[PDB]
């Protein structure tokens, strides 16, 4: 149940919007605290839209 002047105020769509989604991939290393010689080659990838 949504009346006229609610969706009439959908006029404000012109101000902000979003174009499309984008997969973000920025990986990481072990921390200061587990970063040793064998773990220096270690990477962990994380994906998100």
């Amino acid at each position: 149940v949504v009346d006229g002047p609610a969706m009439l105020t959908l006029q404000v769509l012109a101000h902000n919007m979003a174009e499309r989604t984008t997969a973000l991939l920025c990986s990481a290393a072990p921390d200061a605290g587990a970063n040793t010689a064998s773990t220096a080659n270690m990477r962990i990838f994380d994906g998100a839209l």
Binding site: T36, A37, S38, A40
Partner: protein
């Protein structure tokens, strides 16, 4: 032994004759080589210079230019002492008394340190012959080299105040356990100053031209830090090495002089000799015949020659 005697000069307090009996195996600093000598230059009143008594760094400098001697046999007429500097030619291994809180090891070099302990003053008093006696404390030599660096640096903090009064005391020692507290009462300046200068002047010559190339590998040190055990334990937490991390400077003349090999020579010449130029020379080594691996506090350990 090349026998040297010290007679009992004048009178006896009758229990104090027994006090000379339980000093068998101790050390007398007599500033000579004599066939007979009075007991006046023996005691700490002779250790006292003109007007003033030495500090525990000055007593190091006072034990510098005198000669240690081993109590061998105690007569009521004389005391036969064997001149450590020469007459250590003993296959009989003339015996010493350990007067020290540390149970030592077998095989330690033993160097002599003035009494600086909180509870082992070694103060025995003679009142018929008005003299005061401080016996030196025989100790193992790495533990001996852990002490002399503390007491000079404690007197380095006697030059500059600046910091708040809560200083690290330099007064907690570590041998396998065994928390040791020593005495911090007086720090004479000239005993600190002349000891400080040779710490400066030797560290001058211990740097050379090819030494400078090693300084480039200071960030190379911490690269081994997070990838092994040995290095990370070698790298101290209270070190400037972890603090200084936060280059050939070409000047290359001739390049056939072995510049890196020549660096480790003169560094070892003066920075390699820092324990013995500040403190006394070790000439006493732990050597028990029965296979006993340690020597108790108060025991009579057999003594062999220079390490």
């Amino acid at each position: 032994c090349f026998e040297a005697d010290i007679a009992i000069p004048s009178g006896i307090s009758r229990p104090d004759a027994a006090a000379l009996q339980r000093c068998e195996g101790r050390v007398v600093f007599l500033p000579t080589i004599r066939r007979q000598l009075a007991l006046a230059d023996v005691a700490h009143e002779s250790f006292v210079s003109g007007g003033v008594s030495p500090d525990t760094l000055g007593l190091l400098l006072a034990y510098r230019r005198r000669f240690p001697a081993v109590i061998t046999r105690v007569l009521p007429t004389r005391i036969v002492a064997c001149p450590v500097d020469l007459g250590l030619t003993h296959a009989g291994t003339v015996n010493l008394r350990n007067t020290s809180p540390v149970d030592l090891c077998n095989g330690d070099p033993v160097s002599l340190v003035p009494p600086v302990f909180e509870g082992q003053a070694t103060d025995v008093r003679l009142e018929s012959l008005d003299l005061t006696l401080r016996f030196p404390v025989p100790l193992p030599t790495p533990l001996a080299r852990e002490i002399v660096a503390r007491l000079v640096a404690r007197g380095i903090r006697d030059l500059n105040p600046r910091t708040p009064g809560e200083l690290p005391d330099l007064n907690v020692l570590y041998y396998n356990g065994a928390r040791l507290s020593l005495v911090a009462d007086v720090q004479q300046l000239a005993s600190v100053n002349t000891e400080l200068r040779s710490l400066v002047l030797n560290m001058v010559y211990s740097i050379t031209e090819g030494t400078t190339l090693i300084l480039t590998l200071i960030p190379r040190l911490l690269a081994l830090s997070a990838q092994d055990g040995y290095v990370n334990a070698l790298l101290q937490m209270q070190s400037v090495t972890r603090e200084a991390a936060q280059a050939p400077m070409l000047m290359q003349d001739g390049e056939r002089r072995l510049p890196l090999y020549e660096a480790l020579v003169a560094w070892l010449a003066h920075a390699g000799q820092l324990g013995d130029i500040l403190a006394l020379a070790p000439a006493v080594r732990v050597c028990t015949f029965d296979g006993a691996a340690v020597v108790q506090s108060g025991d009579m350990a057999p003594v062999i020659r220079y390490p």
